[PDB]
Structures are given as structure tokens and as C-alpha cells.
Amino acid sequence: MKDFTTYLSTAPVVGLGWAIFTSGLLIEINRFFPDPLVFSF
Amino acid sequence: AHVVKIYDTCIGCTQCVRACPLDVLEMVPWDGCKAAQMASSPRTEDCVGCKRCETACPTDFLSVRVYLGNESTRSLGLAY
Amino acid sequence: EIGPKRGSLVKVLRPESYWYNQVGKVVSVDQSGIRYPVVVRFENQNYAGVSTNNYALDEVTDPP
Amino acid sequence: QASLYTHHQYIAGFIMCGAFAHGAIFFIRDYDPEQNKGNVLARVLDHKEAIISHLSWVSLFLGFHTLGLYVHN
Amino acid sequence: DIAGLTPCSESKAYNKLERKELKVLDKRLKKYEPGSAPYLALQATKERTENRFKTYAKQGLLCGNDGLPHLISDPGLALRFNHAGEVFIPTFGFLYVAGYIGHVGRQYIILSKEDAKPTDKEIILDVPLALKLAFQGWAWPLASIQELRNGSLLEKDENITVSPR
Amino acid sequence: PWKQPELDPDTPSPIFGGSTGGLLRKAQVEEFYVTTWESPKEQIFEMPTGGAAIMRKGPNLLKLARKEHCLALTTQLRTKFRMSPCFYRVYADGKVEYLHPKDGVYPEKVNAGRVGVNQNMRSIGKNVDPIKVKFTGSEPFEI
Amino acid sequence: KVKIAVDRNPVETNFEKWAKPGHFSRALAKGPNTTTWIWNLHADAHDFDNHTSDLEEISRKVFSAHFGQLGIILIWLSGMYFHGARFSNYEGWLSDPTHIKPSAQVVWPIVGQEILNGDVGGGFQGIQITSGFFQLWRASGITSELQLYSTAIGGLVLAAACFFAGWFHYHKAAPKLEWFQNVESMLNHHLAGLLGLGSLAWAGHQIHVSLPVNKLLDAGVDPKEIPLPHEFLLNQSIIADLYPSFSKGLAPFFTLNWAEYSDFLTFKGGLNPVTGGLWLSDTAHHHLAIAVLFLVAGHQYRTNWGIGHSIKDILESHKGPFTGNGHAGLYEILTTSWHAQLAINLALFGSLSIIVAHHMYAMPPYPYLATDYGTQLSLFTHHMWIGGFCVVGAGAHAAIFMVRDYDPTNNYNNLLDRVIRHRDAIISHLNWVSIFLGFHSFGLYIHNDTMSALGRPQDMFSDTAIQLQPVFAQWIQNTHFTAPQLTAPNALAATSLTWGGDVVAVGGKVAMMPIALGTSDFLVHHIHAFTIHVTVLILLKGVLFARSSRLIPDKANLGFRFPCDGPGRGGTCQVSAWDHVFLGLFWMYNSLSIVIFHFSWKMQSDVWGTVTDSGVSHITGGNFAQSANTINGWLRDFLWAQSSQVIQSYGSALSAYGLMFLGAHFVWAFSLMFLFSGRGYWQELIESIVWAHNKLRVAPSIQPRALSITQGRAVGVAHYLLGGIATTWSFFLARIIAVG
Amino acid sequence: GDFLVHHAIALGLHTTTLILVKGALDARGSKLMPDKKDFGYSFPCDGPGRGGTCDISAYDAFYLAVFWMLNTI
Ligand code: CLA
Ligand code: CLA
Ligand code: CLA
Numbered sequence A: 001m002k003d004f005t006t007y008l009s010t011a012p013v014v015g016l017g018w019a020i021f022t023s024g025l026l027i028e029i030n031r032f033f034p035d036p037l038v039f040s041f
Numbered sequence B: 001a002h003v004v005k006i007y008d009t010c011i012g013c014t015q016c017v018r019a020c021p022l023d024v025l026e027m028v029p030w031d032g033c034k035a036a037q038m039a040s041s042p043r044t045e046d047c048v049g050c051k052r053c054e055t056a057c058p059t060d061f062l063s064v065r066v067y068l069g070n071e072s073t074r075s076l077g078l079a080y
Numbered sequence C: 001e002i003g004p005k006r007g008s009l010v011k012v013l014r015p016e017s018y019w020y021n022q023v024g025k026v027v028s029v030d031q032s033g034i035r036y037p038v039v040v041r042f043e044n045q046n047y048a049g050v051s052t053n054n055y056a057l058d059e060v061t062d063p064p
Numbered sequence D: 001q002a003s004l005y006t007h008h009q010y011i012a013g014f015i016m017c018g019a020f021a022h023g024a025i026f027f028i029r030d031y032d033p034e035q036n037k038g039n040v041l042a043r044v045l046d047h048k049e050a051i052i053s054h055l056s057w058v059s060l061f062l063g064f065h066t067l068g069l070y071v072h073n
Numbered sequence E: 001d002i003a004g005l006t007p008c009s010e011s012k013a014y015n016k017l018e019r020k021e022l023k024v025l026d027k028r029l030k031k032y033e034p035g036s037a038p039y040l041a042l043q044a045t046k047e048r049t050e051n052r053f054k055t056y057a058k059q060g061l062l063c064g065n066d067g068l069p070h071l072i073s074d075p076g077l078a079l080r081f082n083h084a085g086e087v088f089i090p091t092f093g094f095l096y097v098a099g100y101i102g103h104v105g106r107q108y109i110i111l112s113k114e115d116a117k118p119t120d121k122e123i124i125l126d127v128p129l130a131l132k133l134a135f136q137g138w139a140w141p142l143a144s145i146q147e148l149r150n151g152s153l154l155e156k157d158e159n160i161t162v163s164p165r
Numbered sequence F: 001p002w003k004q005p006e007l008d009p010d011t012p013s014p015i016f017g018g019s020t021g022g023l024l025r026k027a028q029v030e031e032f033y034v035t036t037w038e039s040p041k042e043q044i045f046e047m048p049t050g051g052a053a054i055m056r057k058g059p060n061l062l063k064l065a066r067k068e069h070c071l072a073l074t075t076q077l078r079t080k081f082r083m084s085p086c087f088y089r090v091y092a093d094g095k096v097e098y099l100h101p102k103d104g105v106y107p108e109k110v111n112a113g114r115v116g117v118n119q120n121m122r123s124i125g126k127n128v129d130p131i132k133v134k135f136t137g138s139e140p141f142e143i
Numbered sequence G: 001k002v003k004i005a006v007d008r009n010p011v012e013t014n015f016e017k018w019a020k021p022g023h024f025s026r027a028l029a030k031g032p033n034t035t036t037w038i039w040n041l042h043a044d045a046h047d048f049d050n051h052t053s054d055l056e057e058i059s060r061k062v063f064s065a066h067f068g069q070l071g072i073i074l075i076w077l078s079g080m081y082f083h084g085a086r087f088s089n090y091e092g093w094l095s096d097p098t099h100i101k102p103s104a105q106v107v108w109p110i111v112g113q114e115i116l117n118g119d120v121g122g123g124f125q126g127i128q129i130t131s132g133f134f135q136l137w138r139a140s141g142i143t144s145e146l147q148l149y150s151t152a153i154g155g156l157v158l159a160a161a162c163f164f165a166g167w168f169h170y171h172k173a174a175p176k177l178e179w180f181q182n183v184e185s186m187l188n189h190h191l192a193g194l195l196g197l198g199s200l201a202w203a204g205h206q207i208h209v210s211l212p213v214n215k216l217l218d219a220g221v222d223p224k225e226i227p228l229p230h231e232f233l234l235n236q237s238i239i240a241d242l243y244p245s246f247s248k249g250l251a252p253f254f255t256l257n258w259a260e261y262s263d264f265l266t267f268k269g270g271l272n273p274v275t276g277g278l279w280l281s282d283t284a285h286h287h288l289a290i291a292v293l294f295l296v297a298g299h300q301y302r303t304n305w306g307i308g309h310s311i312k313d314i315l316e317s318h319k320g321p322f323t324g325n326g327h328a329g330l331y332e333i334l335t336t337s338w339h340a341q342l343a344i345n346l347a348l349f350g351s352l353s354i355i356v357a358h359h360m361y362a363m364p365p366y367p368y369l370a371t372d373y374g375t376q377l378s379l380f381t382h383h384m385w386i387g388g389f390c391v392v393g394a395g396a397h398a399a400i401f402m403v404r405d406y407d408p409t410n411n412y413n414n415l416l417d418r419v420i421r422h423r424d425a426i427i428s429h430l431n432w433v434s435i436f437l438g439f440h441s442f443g444l445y446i447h448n449d450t451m452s453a454l455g456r457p458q459d460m461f462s463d464t465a466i467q468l469q470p471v472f473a474q475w476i477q478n479t480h481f482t483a484p485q486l487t488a489p490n491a492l493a494a495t496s497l498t499w500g501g502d503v504v505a506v507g508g509k510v511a512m513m514p515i516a517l518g519t520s521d522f523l524v525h526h527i528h529a530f531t532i533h534v535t536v537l538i539l540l541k542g543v544l545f546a547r548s549s550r551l552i553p554d555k556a557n558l559g560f561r562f563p564c565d566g567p568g569r570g571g572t573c574q575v576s577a578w579d580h581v582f583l584g585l586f587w588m589y590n591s592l593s594i595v596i597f598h599f600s601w602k603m604q605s606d607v608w609g610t611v612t613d614s615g616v617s618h619i620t621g622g623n624f625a626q627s628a629n630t631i632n633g634w635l636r637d638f639l640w641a642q643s644s645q646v647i648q649s650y651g652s653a654l655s656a657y658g659l660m661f662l663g664a665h666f667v668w669a670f671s672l673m674f675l676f677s678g679r680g681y682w683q684e685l686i687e688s689i690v691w692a693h694n695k696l697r698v699a700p701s702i703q704p705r706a707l708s709i710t711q712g713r714a715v716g717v718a719h720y721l722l723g724g725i726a727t728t729w730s731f732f733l734a735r736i737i738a739v740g
Numbered sequence H: 001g002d003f004l005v006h007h008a009i010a011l012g013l014h015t016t017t018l019i020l021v022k023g024a025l026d027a028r029g030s031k032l033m034p035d036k037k038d039f040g041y042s043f044p045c046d047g048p049g050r051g052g053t054c055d056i057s058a059y060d061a062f063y064l065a066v067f068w069m070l071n072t073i
């Protein structure tokens, strides 16, 4: 597991994990909530 | 032709003369370095300015400097 | 003997050098009386690719 | 009016580029730091990296955000 | 009603744009049976359109001579009039996250530099320290201010590579 | 070297076919270069301006329109076979010049017999600004 | 002699080399000191020549690389089949191909994308596709989505099998170098085995499966009650009524009575009028004859049983006096250099892809494909560009072989050495014909533009004015039209409707109609010849001068991909063969862009259109004979007369094509930074940014460096090509979807 | 839209100013090449050494800045 998780920790996988996390977060915000323009609570 | 100058920062790895395929550079004895060698340019009129000696120079900044200008039939690399 | 201690961290004040105002490690200091006897090794390469260079006595002081 | 505006604007811009190029020519050809040591010119040359970096920052920031809203709209 | 912009609730061009969008959206509705899945998707799109037009109105938003809502950028004018939600609060909203990324990048750079061969740490990330710093960056401006006063944030230029001009 | 060698007109040349890359009208009008070496056996080399040519057991002769071709062939021979050849220059009037080491033991060595030329005892970057040498005809690096 | 030499377990299966990203290269095995280490890592990733000097390990590496690419392509094909199975209107399109546009990509309703789910008909919404998969799934008889699901799952299974095969054939059981050097066995097995077996299997599938399904499809029978192909396969009674020769039951095949098979192995020229594609019986006899031709050609070489041909003997025996040694050593080069075989295979693959595009635009081999103008245009343009890319890569890898794997020992007076010898003559004559073609094509265009601008249309090079009639092409057209009359009397009609006399039409739209060639076609064809001659000049000069040159005699020792040899000799920038390929990519781009512009304009102005009772009306006003002679006519009547739907695509189903168009404009324009500029300015700017990050202590441990000169050129050409390709793709697809 | 195009104009002026100012300040010296004053104002490059020195002169900075000037006007 150590030998594989060392590869898992390199930049291309980090280039996915942050990308998947932030992308999916923005998809769920734009999905459950409609498209707004004003931050009036 | 071009002007090739060698400064006192040279310490003599005798590799700048191998990277030059024009026999411009030569190595003279010296006393300012451990290797007791210093680059010299006797046939500086036969240089084209390809800067391969600059690629081969390991000192920072470079001991050998090649300055362009005043081009001729031999420094332009024409066989015609 | 005439230069800094071997292995000590030093600062280079050579203007035209890539390692101006940087910290390097002394690897050897020549005692034969040459132009640039203080030879130092740096952790970061230059644009050419080398990591070591030689400097004079006046270009090497201890960093604060 | 349109031709006059566009002509004099392009003339002004080319003259701007020439002004900056000839200022660079001044900086390389005839500039003595020993003659003017510690003055405004030497001090501007002293922190030139800060000036270039801040110009790069404001250019990057303007381009990033302006293209962001243009693509968004 | 600043800069000659009517509110979106009392704008004729805003309602004409809404009627035009409802007309073209209902144009595609006549080509499908009401019990179909494209009909449900078109109905949900129309509901999202109506909800967006309703929520964009009655929120202080204004528009002028186009039917498209406008944003007020000047602070104070967006504070005396109810327009701080357009750009004033998103300004601090972005800056908090922007300072979050800059702070955790700085702490990771500082932590990795005090380690043997630190160039490998940039291409070989470590997860537990990066994730710990990721969840320890909520108070980024509080860490940024204290480092600013004491010199740990900045660095004097005697150990900074400077141009040889 | 110990004595400067003069090339022999009698020496043979390697067998080769017709190559478009070769001597031009600059050989007639201006100078051209001639390379000589002595071979132990028949080996195959590649000319810097053409294809492949089988060389002759013994002395050999190559004519190159440029000195760079001559030193490229020299480096190829020295790397591939430890050959150590030498080249010359033949002018339009028949004058012969020796450019490959006049000391004879190559620029890689020193031989304690050549004088340092175009060498500055100052460091690089210690040169004066062009304003200090303006309207003088001398460059800062030429001082 | 030929055997299976395999080494078992040469490489352990572990993530040890996955842990350290830089392991293939000893220069990259130290560490990432500079930011150019990453680009060198992703650049030398698959360059197996400098990883090791052993040819056996390189052969194993490329074998499993091809296995991985095959698995990737199988995954992609399985995904396409799954998309057609799940998110598609294939069932609706089968019952109405002339009124329902194909669609196989369904977007999410997440952010405004519901407008992209266009009303393609059949109670379905989605992205209107252009690959023509529905036409292929109608040719190869496919009725329901269950069959597409089964095909997708089988493709996924075969992709997993291919990936496991790559893992096995590298890590577990790696073949030796003698296994890869069995060229005769390779050629026999990939001629008789691969090509011949696939052609025979496809002919059998067409005869037993596709022929009855396509016979029932164009007869008006709904696909719901069409019998499944296994019923046709097992039961001779059902297949006997559609084709009476099946009642004989393989009797005429062994009794040499093949004339009885003239019902479903027909020899007919033209297209099926009901569907617009080629007759499936003609394709069945075609693939059967191709299988015959590849079965007989796959038993030519000698491998283990004495009889056959030895390729070394064939090469060494063909020697002609103006060539000296004739093909003397080429067997030794092609059995030891991967790059030479890569160049040959890529060149032939690219040229054959060009033939594929031309012969699909000429004869549509799929039902309801000719009337689907978008699928035809997309197929032609796509295979056009893929063929061009393969040809440019062939030139690149030929130059790589020249730099690396070429040695002067084996070749003395052979063809390759003599091509090296007279390379200056070849380059000079190619330059002469380049200048000649460029002048009397483009100067003709400029002269026509000038005479139009000077108000003298009678002095132009047009049909109304003095003309350059393409007599040879028109004579070939007339010969091919009259070919079934005399030279091929057994053909029902002409092999294509390019030169015919009749117009076929399905659903009220023109499927394929005769094509007239005039002065404008002459001008564009000689423009194409000029452009291809220039591109081949650039590639051939880069290949020939990669080893040595009159400028740089030691270019061989400087490697293949190097930026320059310095500013010497006036500046030897872009002197490497890699930069020759870098320029040839742009010249390819210009060539294929003008070619597909000619294709789109000619087919929209003289082929594509809607048939009426009062004559045939095309998509345009038939202005190709009047506007393609001038540059301004080309511009106004092709790039401005069209693209009016791309700009007004907003708010509609094809607005994503307008977005893609403008993003392609962005990327095409963004490339010119990496093309015009250099590195020293960018390096100094990076130094200033490094100082800025140093001031407040966010200095990265890895030193930020500017991109390399070769790296910058690669980024520039990649962004330029991607932008141009996507620009033409968006414009072509939007124009052909909103109109056709 | 007038505001957006004004800020795009400001971006163009800012980027042109950035490149021209950087070329003027780096006209005599830089970390990649301190001795730029010895090579004249308009020189091609220094060679492929030190990673590559293409377009290192202040003349090259002007030449790259003319494109941005043309785009801005
Ligand atoms: C229209 C084409 C085009 C575009 C868009 C740019 C854009 C840029 N150039 Mg420029 N340039 C161009 C043509 C262009 N150039 C040409 C033809 C030349 C003549 C050679 C130059 C010469 C030139 C010089 C000399 C300099 C620039 C600089 C710049 C930057 C200015 C900073 C800025 O505006 O903020 C950013 C502007 C943007 C447009 C943002 C682009 C990035 C967006 C967000 C997309 C990013 C990718 C996206 C997130 C998707 C990710 C995946 C994807 C990567 C696959 C910017 C990156 C300056 C620079 O880099 O210094 C800081 C600089 O010194 N350029
Ligand atoms: C987190 C690390 C970090 C930090 C604190 C900074 C800080 C700075 N940079 Mg730098 N930058 C970074 C990373 C970073 N940069 C990276 C990775 C790149 C390469 C894309 C750049 C490229 C860059 C340029 C080209 C310029 C700056 C400039 C600046 C200054 C303006 C502030 C700003 O937003 O710039 C804008 C920064 C960007 C547009 C880069 C965005 C890239 C992402 C956001 C960084 C990702 C880092 C990562 C998430 C950290 C790892 C987290 C850890 C837990 C593992 C400031 C000193 C400007 C300057 O000189 O101002 C004086 C300038 O011209 N930077
Ligand atoms: C008649 C036997 C036969 C057949 C059918 C093939 C078929 C193929 N070979 Mg070839 N090959 C053969 C004998 C055969 N080989 C022999 C005898 C040798 C030794 C001289 C080689 C050495 C060889 C090399 C060195 C390479 C190939 C490659 C390929 C593939 C090229 C990809 C392509 O064109 O798309 C066609 C693609 C398909 C048809 C996809 C389906 C692929 C199926 C699963 C393969 C089934 C065929 C196989 C022979 C069945 C027996 C294998 C068994 C152990 C499971 C193709 C699948 C390339 C490769 O690596 O790909 C594997 C390659 O570079 N061949």
C-alpha cells in the first residue's frame, strides 16, 4: 500500500483530487441552488 | 570578424576548446587557477559566433565571451 | 587557512553571478594563491545547469 | 472623423513605442551610474524588479478578470 | 434609481425580455407530449427561468434601457442604497478564499524548505501535512497580520537575488 | 608540431560517388581547405558534406569548402577511430596555410609554447559602461 | 527458423517506479531542480531510444504501448456503443432517417446547457451528432438498444483483455528481439491473418446478417417485426425468400457455379435509390474479394517451410544501373530501426486515410449517409486531417531515424546513400517546381482579383472569360462514365455519381449528383498541388539535412530535437529537423484547410441541396463557377456568405458551436506568443516574478524557468493547430447543421 | 459594455507599459545576462546556452511590444 500510495501522492493525482473536489462542489451549488447574481442573503 | 574574449575567471576544464568545431580557441599555461591553464583565441578571425564555448562554459558568469559584429565570408559560414 | 572554514555557509556578493545575495556551502578553498580560490557549492542550479562556482576573498562574507 | 481619429491614435501609439525604445537605448548606450549615484534614476534602477513585478501583476489581474467576464457574458 | 437605472421590478424591458424567453421556451413545448421526459426537462427549465426572473427582481437590482440587470460597483453608494450584495460583499468573499490559498501555499513552502532535498516535495506532495494546513487556514488574515509586523512574512533584500543592472 | 608538415600532391583519395554537396565556385575564387591523414586499414567514414566513402589504407586526402567541415571530419575521425588527423587551407594563388595545431599537440593541451591572446585579467562584468568609451572606437570588452 | 522467443518475468509488477516519476531517463532520475524537469519528464516519457540502448527492451516497450493504445481505442468504441445504447434516438432514427437528425450525446441540465439538447425529432433531445454512427449501425444490421449494449460490454471486455495482454506481454512474458525481427511471419500473419480474416469475417457478417436486415429495412418494413439475424443465420427458410440462392445452400460455392450467387453478391455501379448508400450485396462481394486477395497475398513470404519469398533476396536482387547498389541494405535498416518502419507505416496510413476520406465523399458506403450532409462533411474533414497528421509524423519520425538510427557502415552506394548524395539537386528542383506552381496558381488568383477590381471581367481566368479547362480530369470523368459500356460490361452503372448522368435523392434532398469541373476547380486543384509540393519540400529537406548540411556539418552529433547551434553563421535558428516538422505542421494546416474549404464549397454549391419538381436547387446559388476564381469571391461567398448561422447560433441548439468558435479563435490567437517571441525576455520576466515571490518568502524550492525554445515552438504549434482545427470544426458543423 | 471595453483598453496600456518598462530596465543588465550593455542595443541573442536566450535584447522587447500596441490601438 505504501508503494502505491506514494504514487497516489504525486502531483497528477493531486491535479485531479482538488479538481474533482472543487468542480463537484461548484456543480452541486449551481444545481441545488439556482443561478443568482446578488449576495443579498 | 567577431571578437572572442576570455576573462580571468577561467579555471581550465579544457572543454570549451572541444565544443568549438572551428579551431578558434587554444589553451595556454597560466598561474591564476588550480589547473594552470587559460583559454586563448589566436584564430579569432575564423570564429562565426556559434557560442558553443558559451554552452560549454561552467563558470558563472562565463569566462569566455563571444561578441557578434563585423561579419565576413568566413564568419558567415558560406561555402560559396 | 586564508579563507573561510570548509563546510561553512557563506554569502556571495558578486553582482554578475547568478547567486548574488544567496547562501552557499564552502566545499574547498585553495591555498596556492589563485585568483578565485574560494570554491562553493549551491543547492540550486543556474540556467546553464551547474551548481558550484568559485569566487574571490572579497566576494565571500558570512550571511546574517 | 473616424479616419482622423484612427490615424492619429496609431501615430500616437507608434510614437509611444519609439519613446520607450529610445529610453531603453538611453539606458544601454549612455548611462553612467557613477555620475548619478543615489538619485531618482539609480533608485528606480535599484528596485526595477518590484516595478516590473507589479506591472505584471496588474496586467495579469486586469486580463484575467476582464476575459473572465467577457467569456462569462 | 441611480445613474438613470430603473429597478428590475418596475422595468418594462425586463418584463418584455421575460415574455420573449417564455415564448421561445414554450415554442419547443408544442413538439412533445406532456407525459414525456423532454417535456419534464423543458418544464423544469421554464420553472428555473421563472424563479430566476422572480429572484433577480425585488432584491434591489436595477437595469437601464436594455432589460438586463446592472451592478453598482462604488462602495458607499452600494452601502447607502441596498446594493452591497452585488460586488461589495463578494469582494471580501473572494479575498477570504484568495488569501486562504495564498496562506496555505506559503505555509507549505516554508515547511517544505526546512527539509532535505525540498525540490522533491513540490512534485511528491505529502497528504497529511497539506490537509492539516488546508484545515488550519481559516484564520489566514490573522496569521498574515502577525507575520507582517515581525518580519517573518517579508524578507530583507540582503538574502534576495537581485538583478545586476 | 616538431616540424611543420607540408601536404604531398601524390597522396590518394577515398573512393566516393558523385555528391552534390561539395566544392563550389568559392574554391575557385576564394580559398579552400584540404584535410590529410594516414590510415592503418580500409574503413568506412561519413563525409561532413556527403554520404559514406571507403578510405584508403595509407595516406588520404579530403578537400572541404569550409574549415567547419574539416574540423567536423577531424572530430568524427578522432571519436570513432582515435585517428588524429590534420587539415590545411589552400588559397586562390596557391598559398598553403596550417590551421590545425601549429604546436601539434592540439588545443586541448597547452605545450607551454603559445602566448595568451585576447585575454582580460579583469573579471567579466567589471568592464566599463559604453558611455565611458563612447566616440572612441574601442568596445568595453576590447580594452 | 521462425519461432516464439519469449523471456518470462523480466520486470517486476510493482509501483516502485510509479513512486519516482523520473525513472526512464538517468538525467531526470536525479530530481526536479528546475521547472523544465517536468516538461522533459512529459516529453521524454515515451522516447524509448534514450531510455536504453537495447533494441529488445524498446521492442517490448512499444509492443505494450500499442497494446495500451488498442485498449484505449476499444474503451472509446465501447463508450460510443454504450452512448448509442442509452442516450440516443437510434430506435426513432431507424423508423425515420430522413426526418430525424441523429443524436447520441445528452447534456446535463446543470448550468444553462438545456438549450444544447436540441429538438432532433422523434421525441428526443440531445446534441446532434456528426460521426455518422447511426449510418454504420444501419449498415451493420442493428435494430434495438440491447444489441448496442451487448456490443459495448463486449468492447469493454476486449479492452480489459487488451490491457491485461499488454501487462502480460511486458511484465510477465516479454518476447525477445528475434521474435520481433521475424518480419516475414509478421507480414504473412498481418496480411492473411489480420486483414484477410477480418475481411472474410465481415463478408460473412454482411451476407448472413446485414443483407437481410438491409433488404427488409428499405422495403418499408418496420424494424420491430424484422427478424433477428440469428434467425437468418440458423434458418435457411427465412433467408431463402429474401435471396433465392440460399436455397441451393453452399452447393454453387464448391461446384464452381458462382454465377448463381448473383442476387446477394451483385456487381452494381451506383447507389441504392431508397437509402442513398452503396448496395450491401456489392459490399459483400467486395469484402469477399478483398479477403481472397489478402489470403493469397499472405502466403508470399518464406518463414519456416522452405517455400516463399525472402525479402532480403527480393531487395538485393532489384538493382538497376542508374541506382548503383539497388535496395542493397534496406532489409537491415528496416529490421533494426523502429523509426524507419514508423515513418513508412505512418506515411502509408496517412495517405490511405486521405484515400478513405476521398472515397467516402465520392461513394457513400452507408445507408442515409449521402443525404446526411453533416456526417459526410465531418467524416471527410476528420479523416483528411488525421491523414495529414500521420503524414507529418511520418516525416518527423523519418528525420528521427536519420539522426539516430542511420549509420554509414551498411550503406555505401545504395539508394539511401545516393539520395543523401544528390539531396541538393532534389531540393533545388523541388524549390523550382514550388515557385512555378505557386506563381501560376496564386498569381492567377491575384490576377483574377485584380481584373475583377479593375472592372475587366473579360480579362479574368474564368469560364466566361479566357478559361483553363481541366481537360484531363473531364476526360477521366467521361471515361469512367463510359467504363461500364465497354471496358467493364458486367457493371450495371458507373462506379460513382461524380461523373454520372443521373441524380439520386432520398427524402427530397440530393444524395449524390454529377460534378462539373471548370476553371475554378483547375485553379484550386493546382493550388492544392502547389501546397502539397511545398509541404513535402519542407519535410523532405528536414529529413535530408538532419544528418549534415553545408551550414552545419556536425548536425548529426547535435541530436534530432535541438533549438539551434547559436547565432553563428548569421544565426542557425530552427535548423533542426524538428523545426522543419514544426513549420510543416503549419503548411499541412494551410493545405488541408484550403482542401476542406474547397470540399465544402464545391459540395454545397454543386452537389448538396434539395431536389424539386422544377429542376434541382442546391444549398447555395451555384456560385462556385463564378466566385471561386478570386480571393475576394472565395472570402465573401464562402467565409462570409456562410458562418451567418454561427454568429446567430446564440439562444439555439448550436450556440455551443459559436462558443467553440470563439474559444478556438482565442487559442489560435494565444499561440502567436509562443511563435513570435523567444525565451530571454520571458526568462527575465520570470526572474522579476521570482524576485516578487522572494520578497515575501513564497519562493518555490523548484526554480521557475521559462519554457525551452523547442518547448516554446511545440506549445505554439500545438495551440495554433488546435485553435485552427476547432475553428474550422465549429464553423463547418454549425453551417452544415443549421442549413443541411 | 463601455466600462468593460475601457478596462480592456487599460489592460492593453498596462501590458504594453509592462513589457516596454521591463525591456528598458533590463536593457543593460539581467540575471540571465548581466553584460547586455556590451552587446549593443539591437543584437540577436546570446545562444542556446543557459537554457536559451532568444529575444533577450531590449530591441526584442520593443519588437514584441509593437504587437500589443497594435492590438491595443
Ligand atoms: C489574443 C491573443 C493573446 C492573448 C489572449 C494573450 C494573453 C496574454 N499575454 Mg500576450 N501576446 C500575443 C497574443 C495574446 N496574448 C501576441 C500575438 C504577442 C506578440 C508576440 C503577445 C506578446 C506578449 C508579451 C510580450 C507579453 C504577453 C503577456 C500576456 C498576458 C497578459 C496578462 C493578462 O492580460 O492577463 C491574463 C490574460 C489572459 C487572456 C488569461 C489567459 C488564461 C485564461 C484564464 C485561460 C487559462 C486556461 C483555462 C483555465 C483552461 C485550463 C485548461 C487549459 C489550459 C487546457 C496574457 C497571458 C505578458 C505576460 O505574460 O506577462 C505577465 C507579456 O509580457 N503577451
Ligand atoms: C500559493 C502560492 C503562491 C503565492 C502565495 C503567490 C503569490 C504571488 N504571486 Mg505567484 N504564482 C504561483 C503561486 C503563488 N504565488 C504559481 C503556482 C504560479 C504559476 C502559475 C504563479 C505565477 C505568478 C505570476 C506569473 C505572477 C505572480 C505574482 C504573484 C504576486 C501577486 C499575488 C497573486 O495573486 O498573484 C497571482 C498569482 C497567480 C495568477 C498564480 C495562480 C496559481 C495558483 C492559484 C497557485 C496554486 C498554489 C497551490 C494551490 C499551493 C499549494 C497548497 C499546499 C497546501 C499544497 C504574489 C507575490 C505576480 C507578481 O509578481 O506580483 C508582484 C505575477 O506577475 N505569480
Ligand atoms: C494471424 C495472426 C495475427 C493477427 C490477427 C495479429 C493482429 C495484430 N497485430 Mg500482430 N503479430 C503476429 C500475428 C498476428 N497479429 C505475429 C506472428 C507476430 C510476430 C512476428 C506479430 C507481431 C506484432 C507486433 C510487434 C505488433 C502487432 C500488432 C498487432 C495489432 C495491430 C493493430 C491493428 O492494426 O488494429 C487491429 C486491431 C484489432 C483487430 C483489435 C482486436 C485485437 C485482438 C484482441 C487480437 C487478436 C489476434 C491475436 C493474434 C489472437 C491470438 C492471441 C492469443 C494469445 C489471445 C493487430 C491486432 C501491434 C500490437 O501491439 O497490437 C497488439 C504491434 O505493434 N503484431
Ligand code: CLA
Pocket (backbone or CB within 6 Å): G042, G043, G044, G045, G046, G047, G048, G049, G342, G346, G389, G390, G392, G393, G394, G396, G397, G400, G561, G578, G581, G718, G722
Ligand atoms: C504511429 C504513431 C506514432 C508513434 C508510435 C510515435 C512515437 C514517437 N514520436 Mg511521434 N508523431 C506522430 C505519431 C507517432 N509518434 C505524429 C502523428 C506526429 C505529428 C504531430 C508526431 C510528431 C513527433 C515529433 C515532432 C516528435 C515525435 C516524438 C516521438 C517519440 C516520443 C513521443 C512522446 O514521448 O510524446 C509524449 C507525449 C505527449 C507530449 C503528449 C501529446 C500532447 C500533445 C502535444 C497535445 C495533444 C492535444 C490533444 C490533441 C487535444 C487535447 C486538448 C487539450 C485542451 C486537452 C516516439 C518515438 C519525439 C521524439 O523525440 O522522437 C524520438 C519528437 O520530437 N513525434
Ligand code: CLA
Pocket (backbone or CB within 6 Å): G431, G434, G435, G436, G437, G438, G439, G442, G443, G446, G534, G537, G538, G582, G583, G584, G586, G587
Ligand atoms: C499566406 C501566407 C504566406 C505566403 C504568401 C508566403 C509566401 C512564401 N513562403 Mg511562406 N510561410 C508562411 C506564410 C506565407 N508565406 C508562414 C506563416 C510560415 C510559417 C510556417 C511559412 C513557411 C514557409 C516555408 C517553410 C517555406 C515558405 C516558402 C514561401 C514562398 C513560397 C513561394 C511560392 O511558391 O509561391 C509563389 C509566390 C507567392 C505566392 C508570393 C506572392 C506572389 C504574388 C502573386 C505577386 C506576383 C508577382 C508580382 C506582380 C511581383 C510584384 C512586383 C513589385 C515588386 C513591383 C514565398 C516567399 C517556401 C520557399 O522558400 O519557397 C520554396 C518554403 O520553403 N514559407
Ligand SMILES: CC1=C(/C=C/C(C)=C/C=C/C(C)=C/C=C/C=C(C)/C=C/C=C(C)/C=C/C2=C(C)CCCC2(C)C)C(C)(C)CCC1
Pocket (backbone or CB within 6 Å): D019, D020, D021, D022, D023, D024, D026, D027, H020, H021, H024
Ligand atoms: C488638470 C486636470 C486634472 C489633472 C490632470 C493630471 C494631474 C494629469 C497628469 C498626467 C500625467 C502625470 C501623465 C503622465 C504620462 C507619462 C508618460 C506617457 C510617460 C512616458 C515615459 C516614457 C516613454 C519613458 C521613457 C524613458 C525610458 C523608458 C527610460 C529612461 C529614459 C526615458 C525617460 C526617456 C484632472 C484630471 C484632476 C481634472 C481635469 C483637469
Ligand SMILES: CC1=C(C/C=C(\C)CCC[C@H](C)CCC[C@H](C)CCCC(C)C)C(=O)c2ccccc2C1=O
Pocket (backbone or CB within 6 Å): G673, G674, G675, G677, G678, G679, G682, G705, G706, G707, G708, G709, G711, G712, G713
Ligand atoms: C508565454 C511564453 C512563455 C512563458 C510560459 C510559461 C513559463 C509556461 C506556463 C505554463 C503554466 C504554468 C501551465 C498552467 C496554466 C494555468 C496555471 C492553469 C490554470 C487552471 C485553472 C483551473 C486555475 C515561455 O516560456 C516561452 C518560451 C519560449 C517561447 C515562447 C514562450 C512564451 O510565449
Ligand code: SF4
Pocket (backbone or CB within 6 Å): G563, G564, G565, G566, G567, G568, G571, G572, G573, G574, G678, G709, H044, H045, H046, H047, H048, H052, H053, H054, H055
Ligand atoms: S534567436 Fe534562439 S534559435 Fe535563433 S540562434 Fe539565437 S538562441 Fe538560437
